[PDB]
Design a protein around this ligand. Structure first.
Ligand SMILES: NC(=O)c1cccc2[nH]ccc12
Length: 167
């Protein structure tokens, strides 16, 4: 049993809810929250900007030190950093950004990072301002992740379309 509440069950391991991931993280304090990161860990907008704002910019300060030491992530890659006030850990995962012309086949590689963690609170990778089709992102998630993933979808309209269209 875990603390996640109000989710619709899609599969054995994937759950979904219409929720603000920031508000969900603040309530649950999950072991892992996933950030929709870019390779520079520049948390300007979308899910990343919202998570970073909720940490009072401490996520960005920590991220800048990580990049100064290690250099940029790979598209499809990830790193584990602090979850600050939101979670124990933040798994920063880089899905391909269609608005930069990145290979959508890298979305499966991105989701494979989730398998290193038993339970996660996450957004749909490459959705929103990353430009991919969220229906596709949910399909890749279900077909790639084996660990228990609780998906937060901010937009109610999109949530209802993801559920209604789910095979
Ligand atoms: N760590 C895993 O890959 C995993 C997690 C939960 C259920 C699973 N079934 C087969 C693999 C697997």
């Amino acid at each position: 049993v875990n603390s996640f509440s109000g989710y619709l069950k899609l599969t054995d391991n994937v759950y979904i809810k219409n929720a603000d991931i920031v508000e969900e993280a603040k309530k649950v304090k999950p072991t892992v929250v996933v950030n929709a990161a870019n390779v520079y860990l520049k948390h300007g907008g979308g899910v990343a900007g919202a998570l970073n704002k909720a940490t009072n910019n401490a996520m960005q300060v920590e991220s800048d030190d990580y990049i100064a030491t290690n250099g940029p992530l790979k598209v499809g890659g990830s790193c584990v950093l602090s979850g600050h006030n939101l979670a124990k850990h933040c798994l920063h995962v880089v899905g391909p950004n269609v608005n930069k012309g990145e290979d959508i086949q890298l979305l499966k590689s991105a989701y494979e990072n989730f398998n290193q963690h038993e339970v996660l609170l996450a957004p749909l990778l490459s959705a929103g301002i990353f430009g991919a089709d969220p229906i596709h992102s949910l399909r890749v998630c279900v077909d790639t992740v084996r660990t228990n993933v609780y998906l937060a979808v901010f937009d109610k309209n999109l949530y209802d379309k993801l559920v209604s269209s789910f095979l």
